[PDB]
Short mmCIF file of N, CA, C and O in Angstrom, two decimals:
data_model
loop_
_atom_site.label_atom_id
_atom_site.label_comp_id
_atom_site.label_asym_id
_atom_site.label_seq_id
_atom_site.Cartn_x
_atom_site.Cartn_y
_atom_site.Cartn_z
N UNK A 1 11.79 15.54 -3.97
CA UNK A 1 10.43 15.07 -4.89
C UNK A 1 9.98 13.94 -4.86
O UNK A 1 8.77 13.05 -4.84
N UNK A 2 11.25 12.88 -5.22
CA UNK A 2 11.09 11.87 -5.44
C UNK A 2 10.93 10.87 -3.94
O UNK A 2 10.07 10.54 -4.60
N UNK A 3 11.26 11.13 -2.88
CA UNK A 3 10.50 10.68 -1.98
C UNK A 3 9.33 11.47 -1.79
O UNK A 3 8.12 10.56 -0.91
N UNK A 4 9.00 12.16 -1.59
CA UNK A 4 7.82 12.59 -1.92
C UNK A 4 6.21 11.83 -3.22
O UNK A 4 5.03 11.33 -2.14
N UNK A 5 6.74 11.66 -3.84
CA UNK A 5 6.22 10.91 -4.43
C UNK A 5 5.90 9.46 -4.28
O UNK A 5 5.17 8.78 -4.83
N UNK A 6 6.55 9.01 -3.95
CA UNK A 6 7.15 7.28 -3.36
C UNK A 6 5.95 7.65 -2.16
O UNK A 6 5.01 7.10 -1.77
N UNK A 7 5.85 8.79 -0.88
CA UNK A 7 4.52 8.86 0.35
C UNK A 7 3.25 8.83 -0.39
O UNK A 7 2.74 8.43 -0.45
N UNK A 8 3.54 9.77 -1.81
CA UNK A 8 2.31 9.81 -2.03
C UNK A 8 1.79 8.43 -2.99
O UNK A 8 0.15 8.81 -2.63
N UNK A 9 2.55 7.66 -3.07
CA UNK A 9 1.62 6.49 -4.25
C UNK A 9 1.49 5.54 -3.34
O UNK A 9 0.46 5.03 -3.33
N UNK A 10 2.70 5.23 -1.79
CA UNK A 10 1.85 4.43 -0.86
C UNK A 10 0.55 4.37 -0.59
O UNK A 10 0.15 3.84 -0.11
N UNK A 11 0.09 5.93 -0.45
CA UNK A 11 -0.57 6.38 0.04
C UNK A 11 -2.02 5.91 -0.42
O UNK A 11 -2.77 5.52 -0.42
N UNK A 12 -1.93 6.79 -2.55
CA UNK A 12 -2.73 6.38 -3.01
C UNK A 12 -3.29 4.68 -3.33
O UNK A 12 -3.97 4.32 -3.21
N UNK A 13 -1.61 4.24 -3.77
CA UNK A 13 -1.72 3.01 -3.78
C UNK A 13 -3.59 1.81 -2.50
O UNK A 13 -4.16 1.57 -3.30
N UNK A 14 -2.45 1.88 -1.85
CA UNK A 14 -3.73 1.29 -0.15
C UNK A 14 -4.58 2.45 -0.65
O UNK A 14 -5.38 1.00 -0.21
N UNK A 15 -5.05 3.12 -0.47
CA UNK A 15 -6.13 3.44 -0.79
C UNK A 15 -7.33 2.77 -2.23
O UNK A 15 -8.80 2.33 -1.75
N UNK A 16 -6.32 3.40 -3.10
CA UNK A 16 -6.90 3.03 -4.41
C UNK A 16 -7.69 1.80 -4.49
O UNK A 16 -8.28 0.72 -4.98
N UNK A 17 -6.40 0.84 -3.69
CA UNK A 17 -6.49 -0.75 -3.88
C UNK A 17 -7.70 -1.07 -3.19
O UNK A 17 -8.45 -2.65 -3.49
N UNK A 18 -8.40 -0.69 -1.45
CA UNK A 18 -8.77 -0.95 -1.00
C UNK A 18 -9.44 -0.85 -1.01
O UNK A 18 -11.32 -1.01 -1.37
N UNK A 19 -10.65 0.90 -2.04
CA UNK A 19 -11.33 1.12 -2.46
C UNK A 19 -12.14 0.60 -3.69
O UNK A 19 -12.76 0.33 -3.78
N UNK A 20 -10.85 -0.44 -4.47
CA UNK A 20 -11.03 -0.41 -6.00
C UNK A 20 -11.44 -2.08 -5.55
O UNK A 20 -12.17 -2.47 -6.37
N UNK A 21 -10.90 -2.91 -4.69
CA UNK A 21 -11.07 -3.96 -3.84
C UNK A 21 -13.51 -4.38 -3.07
O UNK A 21 -14.04 -4.99 -3.10
N UNK A 22 -13.41 -3.14 -2.89
CA UNK A 22 -14.48 -3.28 -2.22
C UNK A 22 -15.50 -2.68 -3.35
O UNK A 22 -16.74 -2.71 -3.18
N UNK A 23 -15.07 -1.56 -4.68
CA UNK A 23 -15.65 -2.11 -5.68
C UNK A 23 -16.19 -2.60 -5.92
O UNK A 23 -17.65 -2.37 -7.22
N UNK A 24 -14.51 -3.45 -6.66
CA UNK A 24 -15.32 -4.62 -7.16
C UNK A 24 -16.45 -5.93 -6.42
O UNK A 24 -17.45 -6.48 -7.43
N UNK A 25 -15.54 -6.27 -5.52
CA UNK A 25 -16.99 -6.73 -5.00
C UNK A 25 -18.29 -5.82 -4.88
O UNK A 25 -19.44 -7.21 -5.62
N UNK A 26 -18.81 -4.54 -4.83
CA UNK A 26 -19.76 -4.24 -4.90
C UNK A 26 -20.47 -4.87 -6.21
O UNK A 26 -21.55 -4.39 -6.31
N UNK A 27 -20.07 -4.05 -6.86
CA UNK A 27 -19.89 -4.02 -8.60
C UNK A 27 -20.98 -5.86 -9.20
O UNK A 27 -21.73 -5.80 -9.51
N UNK A 28 -19.44 -6.18 -8.22
CA UNK A 28 -20.12 -8.08 -8.95
C UNK A 28 -21.82 -8.02 -8.23
O UNK A 28 -22.14 -8.80 -8.74
N UNK A 29 -21.59 -7.96 -6.51
CA UNK A 29 -22.44 -8.11 -6.01
C UNK A 29 -24.24 -7.67 -6.54
O UNK A 29 -24.86 -8.21 -6.92
N UNK A 30 -23.80 -6.54 -7.14
CA UNK A 30 -25.27 -5.19 -7.80
C UNK A 30 -25.41 -5.75 -9.22
O UNK A 30 -26.57 -5.68 -9.17
N UNK A 31 -23.89 -6.42 -10.39
CA UNK A 31 -24.29 -7.18 -10.70
C UNK A 31 -25.85 -8.33 -11.13
O UNK A 31 -27.10 -8.24 -11.77
N UNK A 32 -24.85 -8.86 -10.24
CA UNK A 32 -25.34 -10.31 -10.22
C UNK A 32 -27.19 -10.07 -8.88
O UNK A 32 -28.03 -10.56 -9.86
N UNK A 33 -27.34 -9.21 -8.78
CA UNK A 33 -28.65 -8.89 -7.77
C UNK A 33 -29.32 -8.16 -8.94
O UNK A 33 -30.71 -8.57 -8.93
N UNK A 34 -29.08 -7.38 -9.76
CA UNK A 34 -29.78 -7.01 -11.54
C UNK A 34 -29.97 -8.08 -11.77
O UNK A 34 -31.21 -7.95 -12.53
N UNK A 35 -29.05 -9.45 -12.33
CA UNK A 35 -29.06 -10.36 -12.73
C UNK A 35 -31.13 -10.97 -12.38
O UNK A 35 -31.50 -11.41 -12.80
N UNK A 36 -30.69 -11.18 -10.95
CA UNK A 36 -31.77 -11.75 -10.18
C UNK A 36 -33.08 -11.20 -10.58
O UNK A 36 -34.41 -11.41 -10.60
N UNK A 37 -32.54 -10.54 -10.59
CA UNK A 37 -34.17 -8.81 -10.46
C UNK A 37 -35.00 -9.18 -11.75
O UNK A 37 -36.85 -9.40 -11.86
N UNK A 38 -33.58 -8.90 -12.49
CA UNK A 38 -34.26 -9.44 -13.74
C UNK A 38 -34.96 -10.59 -14.56
O UNK A 38 -36.23 -10.44 -14.92
N UNK A 39 -34.50 -11.22 -14.11
CA UNK A 39 -35.14 -12.93 -13.72
C UNK A 39 -36.40 -13.34 -13.11
O UNK A 39 -37.07 -13.41 -13.27
N UNK A 40 -36.85 -13.05 -11.89
CA UNK A 40 -37.65 -12.54 -11.25
C UNK A 40 -38.52 -11.90 -12.22
O UNK A 40 -39.49 -12.08 -11.93
N UNK A 41 -38.35 -10.04 -12.95
CA UNK A 41 -38.85 -9.89 -13.67
C UNK A 41 -39.42 -10.93 -14.23
O UNK A 41 -40.96 -10.92 -15.23
N UNK A 42 -39.40 -11.46 -15.01
CA UNK A 42 -39.40 -12.21 -16.40
C UNK A 42 -40.48 -13.14 -15.58
O UNK A 42 -41.39 -13.12 -16.60
N UNK A 43 -39.65 -14.49 -14.67
CA UNK A 43 -40.43 -14.89 -14.34
C UNK A 43 -42.15 -14.50 -14.09
O UNK A 43 -43.29 -14.98 -14.59
N UNK A 44 -41.99 -13.21 -13.43
CA UNK A 44 -43.31 -12.96 -13.20
C UNK A 44 -44.24 -12.13 -14.38
O UNK A 44 -45.14 -12.56 -14.68
N UNK A 45 -43.85 -12.08 -15.39
CA UNK A 45 -44.28 -11.45 -16.50
C UNK A 45 -44.97 -12.94 -17.32
O UNK A 45 -46.20 -13.13 -18.00
N UNK A 46 -44.56 -14.05 -17.74
CA UNK A 46 -44.29 -15.35 -17.56
C UNK A 46 -45.75 -15.51 -16.29
O UNK A 46 -46.69 -15.81 -17.86
N UNK A 47 -45.97 -15.50 -15.76
CA UNK A 47 -46.70 -15.64 -14.54
C UNK A 47 -48.27 -14.83 -15.08
O UNK A 47 -49.55 -15.49 -14.86
N UNK A 48 -47.76 -13.30 -15.29
CA UNK A 48 -48.29 -12.75 -16.29
C UNK A 48 -49.70 -13.03 -16.93
O UNK A 48 -50.70 -12.98 -17.32
N UNK A 49 -48.08 -13.25 -18.51
CA UNK A 49 -48.79 -13.77 -19.30
C UNK A 49 -49.66 -15.57 -18.89
O UNK A 49 -51.10 -15.05 -19.41
N UNK A 50 -49.77 -16.08 -18.04
CA UNK A 50 -50.13 -16.73 -18.01
C UNK A 50 -51.28 -17.35 -17.45
O UNK A 50 -53.02 -18.33 -17.97
N UNK A 51 -51.72 -16.48 -16.75
CA UNK A 51 -52.59 -16.10 -16.60
C UNK A 51 -53.86 -15.09 -17.44
O UNK A 51 -54.86 -15.56 -17.17
N UNK A 52 -53.21 -14.49 -18.18
CA UNK A 52 -54.12 -13.74 -18.83
C UNK A 52 -54.64 -14.88 -19.50
O UNK A 52 -55.54 -15.21 -20.30
N UNK A 53 -54.17 -15.64 -20.63
CA UNK A 53 -54.37 -16.85 -21.60
C UNK A 53 -54.91 -17.50 -21.13
O UNK A 53 -56.69 -18.09 -21.19
N UNK A 54 -54.39 -17.83 -19.73
CA UNK A 54 -55.82 -18.89 -19.46
C UNK A 54 -57.28 -18.08 -18.14
O UNK A 54 -58.14 -18.89 -18.93
N UNK A 55 -57.53 -16.70 -18.43
CA UNK A 55 -58.25 -15.81 -18.09
C UNK A 55 -59.11 -16.15 -19.86
O UNK A 55 -60.43 -16.47 -19.72
N UNK A 56 -58.48 -16.16 -20.87
CA UNK A 56 -59.14 -15.26 -21.86
C UNK A 56 -59.12 -17.04 -22.22
O UNK A 56 -61.07 -16.94 -22.84
N UNK A 57 -58.46 -18.71 -22.37
CA UNK A 57 -59.65 -19.19 -22.81
C UNK A 57 -60.11 -19.68 -22.35
O UNK A 57 -61.31 -20.83 -23.33
N UNK B 1 59.61 16.36 15.50
CA UNK B 1 59.86 15.31 16.09
C UNK B 1 59.19 14.11 16.91
O UNK B 1 57.30 14.27 16.78
N UNK B 2 59.11 14.85 18.02
CA UNK B 2 58.40 14.79 19.76
C UNK B 2 57.35 15.39 19.20
O UNK B 2 56.41 15.21 19.34
N UNK B 3 56.67 16.24 18.65
CA UNK B 3 55.30 17.99 18.10
C UNK B 3 54.86 15.81 17.67
O UNK B 3 53.56 16.17 18.02
N UNK B 4 55.44 15.38 16.36
CA UNK B 4 54.42 14.52 15.16
C UNK B 4 54.07 13.62 16.09
O UNK B 4 52.63 13.46 16.42
N UNK B 5 54.89 13.35 17.03
CA UNK B 5 54.57 11.47 17.58
C UNK B 5 53.24 12.21 18.57
O UNK B 5 52.04 10.71 19.23
N UNK B 6 53.40 13.49 19.63
CA UNK B 6 52.53 13.77 20.19
C UNK B 6 50.99 13.94 19.79
O UNK B 6 50.38 14.27 20.57
N UNK B 7 50.76 14.50 18.76
CA UNK B 7 49.68 14.88 18.78
C UNK B 7 49.27 13.74 18.30
O UNK B 7 48.27 13.22 17.01
N UNK B 8 49.74 12.73 16.66
CA UNK B 8 50.01 11.02 16.37
C UNK B 8 49.20 10.43 17.33
O UNK B 8 47.85 9.38 17.15
N UNK B 9 49.22 9.96 18.84
CA UNK B 9 48.72 9.65 19.72
C UNK B 9 48.17 10.39 20.48
O UNK B 9 46.97 9.89 20.57
N UNK B 10 47.96 11.37 20.46
CA UNK B 10 45.91 12.45 20.48
C UNK B 10 45.41 12.20 19.14
O UNK B 10 44.22 11.64 19.55
N UNK B 11 45.97 12.11 18.48
CA UNK B 11 45.24 11.91 16.88
C UNK B 11 44.10 10.72 17.33
O UNK B 11 43.89 10.36 16.94
N UNK B 12 45.54 9.52 17.47
CA UNK B 12 44.65 8.13 17.51
C UNK B 12 42.83 8.27 18.65
O UNK B 12 42.63 7.40 19.01
N UNK B 13 43.77 9.13 20.43
CA UNK B 13 42.85 8.79 20.79
C UNK B 13 41.49 9.95 20.56
O UNK B 13 40.09 8.46 20.56
N UNK B 14 41.75 10.29 19.80
CA UNK B 14 40.19 11.06 19.02
C UNK B 14 39.43 9.59 17.83
O UNK B 14 38.51 9.84 18.16
N UNK B 15 40.58 9.22 17.54
CA UNK B 15 39.95 8.82 16.66
C UNK B 15 39.02 7.35 17.50
O UNK B 15 37.81 6.87 16.79
N UNK B 16 39.65 7.10 18.33
CA UNK B 16 39.25 6.28 19.74
C UNK B 16 37.98 6.44 19.41
O UNK B 16 36.63 5.58 19.86
N UNK B 17 37.83 7.44 20.70
CA UNK B 17 36.67 8.71 21.73
C UNK B 17 35.39 8.29 19.98
O UNK B 17 34.27 7.31 20.24
N UNK B 18 36.18 8.77 19.06
CA UNK B 18 34.96 8.80 17.93
C UNK B 18 34.17 7.39 17.46
O UNK B 18 32.92 7.47 17.51
N UNK B 19 34.85 6.75 17.30
CA UNK B 19 34.96 5.25 16.76
C UNK B 19 34.07 4.92 17.83
O UNK B 19 32.95 4.08 17.75
N UNK B 20 34.16 5.14 19.00
CA UNK B 20 34.11 4.16 19.69
C UNK B 20 32.20 4.64 20.49
O UNK B 20 31.43 4.01 20.94
N UNK B 21 32.45 6.28 20.61
CA UNK B 21 30.83 6.81 21.37
C UNK B 21 31.03 7.42 20.21
O UNK B 21 29.50 8.15 20.54
N UNK B 22 30.68 8.26 19.14
CA UNK B 22 30.42 9.30 17.84
C UNK B 22 29.61 8.15 17.13
O UNK B 22 28.50 8.71 16.31
N UNK B 23 30.62 7.36 16.64
CA UNK B 23 30.01 7.03 15.25
C UNK B 23 28.88 5.79 15.68
O UNK B 23 28.49 5.60 14.36
N UNK B 24 29.23 5.96 16.50
CA UNK B 24 27.94 4.16 16.91
C UNK B 24 26.45 5.18 16.30
O UNK B 24 25.44 4.81 15.60
N UNK B 25 26.16 5.73 17.47
CA UNK B 25 25.09 6.45 17.10
C UNK B 25 24.98 7.33 15.78
O UNK B 25 23.78 7.13 15.35
N UNK B 26 25.67 8.04 15.52
CA UNK B 26 25.56 8.58 13.23
C UNK B 26 25.34 7.22 12.32
O UNK B 26 24.09 7.48 11.99
N UNK B 27 25.90 6.32 12.79
CA UNK B 27 25.22 5.46 12.03
C UNK B 27 24.21 4.25 12.23
O UNK B 27 23.20 3.24 11.39
N UNK B 28 23.45 4.77 13.54
CA UNK B 28 22.62 4.57 14.05
C UNK B 28 21.49 4.93 13.36
O UNK B 28 20.42 4.69 12.55
N UNK B 29 21.83 6.27 13.49
CA UNK B 29 20.95 7.97 12.70
C UNK B 29 20.46 7.09 11.11
O UNK B 29 19.67 7.35 10.10
N UNK B 30 21.99 6.83 10.51
CA UNK B 30 21.75 6.24 9.19
C UNK B 30 21.32 5.73 8.39
O UNK B 30 20.07 5.67 7.77
N UNK B 31 20.62 4.23 9.16
CA UNK B 31 20.60 3.09 9.21
C UNK B 31 19.73 3.26 9.51
O UNK B 31 18.54 2.71 8.43
N UNK B 32 18.78 4.23 10.25
CA UNK B 32 17.81 4.05 10.91
C UNK B 32 16.61 4.48 9.18
O UNK B 32 15.75 4.22 8.95
N UNK B 33 17.46 6.28 9.24
CA UNK B 33 16.81 6.91 8.00
C UNK B 33 16.53 6.30 6.31
O UNK B 33 16.09 5.65 5.87
N UNK B 34 18.37 5.44 6.57
CA UNK B 34 18.59 5.02 5.12
C UNK B 34 17.69 3.31 4.90
O UNK B 34 17.44 3.39 3.62
N UNK B 35 17.88 2.83 6.12
CA UNK B 35 17.75 1.88 6.26
C UNK B 35 15.53 2.01 6.02
O UNK B 35 15.02 0.95 5.18
N UNK B 36 15.31 2.44 6.35
CA UNK B 36 13.88 3.23 6.75
C UNK B 36 13.56 3.29 5.02
O UNK B 36 12.51 3.33 4.88
N UNK B 37 14.18 4.35 4.69
CA UNK B 37 14.02 4.02 2.86
C UNK B 37 13.52 3.38 2.25
O UNK B 37 13.06 3.60 1.39
N UNK B 38 15.06 2.99 2.80
CA UNK B 38 14.78 1.62 1.64
C UNK B 38 13.00 0.41 2.01
O UNK B 38 12.53 0.78 0.70
N UNK B 39 13.60 0.97 2.64
CA UNK B 39 12.13 0.01 3.33
C UNK B 39 10.51 0.22 2.76
O UNK B 39 9.77 -0.14 2.20
N UNK B 40 10.19 2.02 3.22
CA UNK B 40 9.16 2.67 2.54
C UNK B 40 9.70 3.21 0.76
O UNK B 40 8.07 2.16 0.34
N UNK B 41 10.69 2.32 0.06
CA UNK B 41 10.56 1.54 -0.64
C UNK B 41 9.61 1.10 -1.58
O UNK B 41 8.50 0.83 -2.07
N UNK B 42 10.21 0.15 -0.60
CA UNK B 42 10.09 -1.47 -1.08
C UNK B 42 8.19 -1.47 -0.39
O UNK B 42 7.63 -1.61 -1.08
N UNK B 43 7.57 -0.46 -0.27
CA UNK B 43 5.77 -0.62 0.74
C UNK B 43 5.90 -0.22 -0.49
O UNK B 43 4.43 -0.96 -0.66
N UNK B 44 6.30 1.20 -1.36
CA UNK B 44 5.06 1.30 -2.10
C UNK B 44 5.17 0.45 -3.19
O UNK B 44 3.83 0.71 -3.86
N UNK B 45 6.10 0.16 -3.23
CA UNK B 45 6.10 -1.15 -4.46
C UNK B 45 5.06 -1.82 -4.10
O UNK B 45 4.34 -2.52 -4.59
N UNK B 46 5.02 -2.51 -3.27
CA UNK B 46 4.28 -3.71 -2.61
C UNK B 46 2.44 -3.32 -2.99
O UNK B 46 1.77 -3.94 -3.18
N UNK B 47 2.39 -1.34 -2.60
CA UNK B 47 1.51 -1.75 -2.96
C UNK B 47 1.09 -1.49 -4.17
O UNK B 47 -0.48 -1.65 -4.97
N UNK B 48 1.93 -0.56 -4.65
CA UNK B 48 1.93 -0.70 -6.60
C UNK B 48 0.74 -2.12 -6.87
O UNK B 48 -0.14 -1.84 -7.60
N UNK B 49 2.05 -3.29 -6.37
CA UNK B 49 1.53 -4.57 -6.79
C UNK B 49 0.22 -4.45 -6.90
O UNK B 49 -0.54 -5.19 -6.86
N UNK B 50 0.20 -4.50 -5.64
CA UNK B 50 -1.65 -4.62 -4.47
C UNK B 50 -2.43 -3.53 -5.65
O UNK B 50 -3.89 -4.47 -6.04
#
């Protein structure tokens, strides 16, 4: 049973380590791009507010 | 007396034969197996670390 579980762990770790490195890279990229998207939306909201204030004034 | 000496020479021959031609292959199997299992446990440990 010990040999069996050892095989099982060798299998999972390799897999889970690979998948978790991939997931860490993907999640860092996703969070960074979400931050960029929020920044772009904020800048566009500022542009819209500026256009609105110039038009109203 | 003589029977014991003759059989003892025969047993020396048997021991030499097994040590020279039968022991090496069995030892190779054990080393491949035991050594291999050691290597596998090691790999599993490294993978857990990873």
